């Protein structure tokens, strides 16, 4: 505006920020502070090899599980303090064509999903894929829309069995007497299931003792009628079992939603308040 | 081509208008506004105009953009 | 209804001057009284 | 016994949510995500005999046609392209395929009969295309219909195909009257061009420069689209608001994604595609998050096509009565993993600013009958196109019921008071200052509607607030304070805040307005400071 | 008879697939979407313009 | 459950708190403009009511974001409770909300 | 002093339209506050200080600007 | 990796939005349409001076 | 040129991978939803390394299909 007092630009006693006035040689590009982190100089630009950490100029030949997949070998440049804020290279620029999406029919009309923050983040619609092609829809599982690509990265420490119709746990008292860690894992999983979030979890949770002393197992059957068995192996904790069960339950919920059956979304309830009390206790203990 | 052929004729605006000696703010702050009755009420100020924090913070173009 | 809701702004007199406090300005000219000019 | 009261008392059943004691089914969950299916399409006699042989020219119609033929800048000139008696268009008014009106609405717009046939015999003054630059030469002509079987010699003027017979301007059947009626619009268009053509030329030049900068095609359509976009980058101060003396506010209903309604406003065929000022309502932006001391108002200014009136739409992000949580960590923990989110309630008003006209509104009787039919509250002097655009936008959005004026807001407030007096139904959880419930309750909605009534300029707003204040709840008192601020009653606001007992409500009430010292408002009685009393009452008068 | 007018005030020609700013451009896959809003008169106008151009061709 | 509505008397409030503590009431809630639960007079009247875990005391104020009536309805519905009211004085018949509604409708 | 500060704030608010800046919120002089409003200037004092410095009397008694007044001896 | 669904979907959506909403995503144009050479560039072009 | 709301307000600096979508409605920050719901207002490690993500359904159920000495999947190869 005009009523306010802007900063002097042409004439002023204040320091005019031009460090390059007496520190750069030859042509200086108007890009401010392009050669500043180098030490405010534009010499020794003929060096091809510089001090490099992992993921920098000369480490392209070497293999590093991260950069080998998350950085192109030709995209490597100069060292840390020698970063390329501005590069000038003579030659004929080449606009290589952009990648073309694959496994998509020709002339197919996709379906568009308008993502917006108004939809809660936990909803599977956010993790769904925006552009949906008819050829991406599995029609033999009953799905109408293609399956979500991303999945929530939460670490499920409790169990939420609303979307699963039944859970059966087979356990062996003789194997308990033997004293295997799988026994404890399954027992803790059963305890956490019966203390799960769904109202009256005992309604859906059932325990059957080993009528024939067979290896313990878990079977979760969903509303869709499908079933899933978490492979129980040594060195598997109840935490890992619950994580697997909840991840597969989320996948099954996504599949059912794609099929087109209404699925009761979760909401804060008595179990949520029972978690709130312990969360507040943890917060107070940490504060103390 | 540049070294050989002449450049295009200079645009009239370029050589008729001056080079502004100041650089007005990206987000100028104007507390004055005549829309809300009783301007003392803050909760009716338009949101489209910048805040003072925005006026001070916006020293560079928007994130994706590079040219002023 | 219509009269209750509608609001018609007052008539702004053509070439009306406004003071610093936005008050309506009435014709008033000031000249140095101590000066003894020819008119 | 009203639909609003019935909805408030026995709300519809939404996504059920069971619990260990009950099941909550009336929660107002947000609309599931939108989708675009290419398979679904975008769309969703006597007149014949008259055209063939029965058409006959009466004396008055013959005289009018002869006068028009004799004719006794393009913006001011009024053409008359008379057709031949065999070439007259005979038939009923056919709504465009993109017309979401109900059967009753269509009958009302056709005046009790959709079968009625109107004979169109000549064109008239032209208006610019919607997408074209607003200050462009008239392209689409107007129509002059005449009912072949009518007791009085009435002539209807149709500005465009998007306005039904209910909005066609009737004329006294005189050539001079028709010429004056058309000259009103011609002069209005000429004034609009003379006023806002330089600004649009500047905008066009800037749009061309920006297209040159960001490499993009520079076609005429591309330039027009970029001008419509740059409408976003319009300064409030340099906006054609307060242009015409006449003003009137209307309520477009509470919403949750105001951009969804603003899209309808933009796409309304009766409005230009290049508004003077537009602001995208991103409720999640750090400067647009609604709060009790909310950010303010998002303003979008549009201009009508035919009558150069202004629709100044205002999304009031500030209007709120729900206090912020006192335990934000706990609130976030509660609402982190939830897949159900309650729908918001953000109000959208619209000021109609139109020039002082004696014929563009149709003489008053047209809008009087329109109001008597649609239960609206349009002023008799409103231009027909503005009212038609508002009605079309509301019907398209699906909020005709929420389209209310001052009297409608009064009735809604009465229904809210009745609901408040009646017992309140339970909700997901009661909500406390530590963990408030993001579900608008009866008291909060009452306060918000008091604020809406104040926003809709009402001479009795101060009296209504004064009568409500003695018996009301804290949310209602907050709403009354905000309404007093909106009206401009500083004394009333000071009285309300002084009467308010200490609490976060009073704290936020003080934080609302720009004040010298909080004590000037808090201290109902002057409290001695340094053995000196301060009388701040004169400030708020 | 009509007074001369400047090219700026003269109407601007539009292509068969032109749509205003809020609507998206035309593509083979998304003909006139993606747009959640429905019953858009301008899309129908563009379709009619395309039909007229095709008939003229 | 106990609810205290517009007590405003520190001594009476303290004595009520003492009686509630003695009777081991499940929970006491001060609803409407009740005398400050933490006041010198209230503490003088109530020797150890504020420091007793058996009788949890809550202070619900509509002027701080608490829907006290909503909380009461939620408690009643959850616990299948029955409400009983007691007024120190009688209750007359007089109202103006009807007049306000009539004016709004007119 | 509180009354002086309140009056100064009220004057500044009345001038808010063309006002460019506000007065100090910490009263430097607890017996004299001056609000300049363009060509107009308002001085709010206490009775004692007002009687001490009689600016009103000086500005009412001072003669107008006579051009011939400069035709005198230097001082 | 030969087909990563997440990358493919996100990139396809990005390209579709850039193609169908050029005004909204104008600032992203420079990613694929770099300014031509020989035209004045704000951060690169340095022009000669004069002697007087 | 002139003053603009683009100059006024600054967007979130979020990488493409982290960004859930480029839609105008999702342009804002994630915490904006919580801020709106509550009606209130409110750094990479030195060596930030991530193992490449895989589609949820494919990663949770990876068929035990192999070739001569390389795992073969509809989306990925590997060595074993």
From TrEMBL, chain B:
Protein origin, superkingdom: Eukaryota
The name this protein goes by in its record: Uncharacterized protein
Organism: Trypanosoma brucei equiperdum
UniProtKB/TrEMBL annotation, chain D:
GO CC, any one term: mitochondrial large ribosomal subunit
Descriptive protein name: Uncharacterized protein
Organism for this UniProt entry: Trypanosoma brucei brucei (strain 927/4 GUTat10.1)
Gene designation per UniProt: Tb08.28L1.320
From TrEMBL, chain F:
The organism's place on the tree of life at top rank: Eukaryota
Record-annotated tRNA/rRNA methyltransferase SpoU type domain positions: 1-55
UniProt name for this protein: SpoU rRNA Methylase family
Residue range from the parent sequence: 239 to 344 of 586
UniProtKB/TrEMBL annotation, chain I:
Superkingdom in the source lineage: Eukaryota
Name under which the protein is recorded: Uncharacterized protein
Species this chain originates from: Trypanosoma brucei equiperdum
Residues of the full protein shown: 27 to 112 of 113
